[PDB]
C-alpha cells in the first residue's frame, strides 16, 4: 500500500518575532501543537518556556 501527501492547501508557514526584552519570542505558526513549538524553540534558544 502506497503513501499519501497531506496536501493541506496552506503550505508550511510561520512568523517568528523577537520582542527585544528578556529574549522573549512570539511565534505565529500554522501548527497542530503549540506546546511542542514552545518547547523546541525554547530548547533551541536555551530559554525557559
Amino acid at each position: 500500500m502506497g503513501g499519501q501527501e497531506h496536501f493541506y492547501m496552506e503550505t508550511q508557514s510561520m512568523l517568528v518575532v523577537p520582542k527585544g526584552e528578556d529574549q522573549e519570542m512570539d511565534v505565529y505558526v500554522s501548527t497542530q501543537f503549540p506546546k511542542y513549538i514552545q518547547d523546541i524553540v525554547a530548547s533551541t534558544l536555551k530559554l525557559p518556556a
Partner: protein, 49 residues
C-alpha cells in the same frame, strides 16, 4: 537658625517640622478587588500576570 537670623539682615534661615497621617483605602470593597493568572509550564518556569 535664631542665632543666624539675629546676625544676618539680607539672608535668613528657617526650620519647620510637619507630621503625616496618610489614610489608605477606597470607597468600597468592590473597588479594592484584584485578580491574577498563574501558569506553570512543564519545564517548571512560571508566567504570572
Amino acid at each position: 537658625v535664631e542665632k543666624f537670623n539675629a546676625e544676618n539682615y539680607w539672608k535668613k534661615k528657617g526650620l519647620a517640622m510637619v507630621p503625616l497621617k496618610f489614610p489608605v483605602g477606597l470607597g468600597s470593597r468592590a473597588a479594592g478587588q484584584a485578580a491574577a493568572l498563574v501558569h506553570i509550564y512543564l519545564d517548571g518556569s512560571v508566567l504570572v500576570t
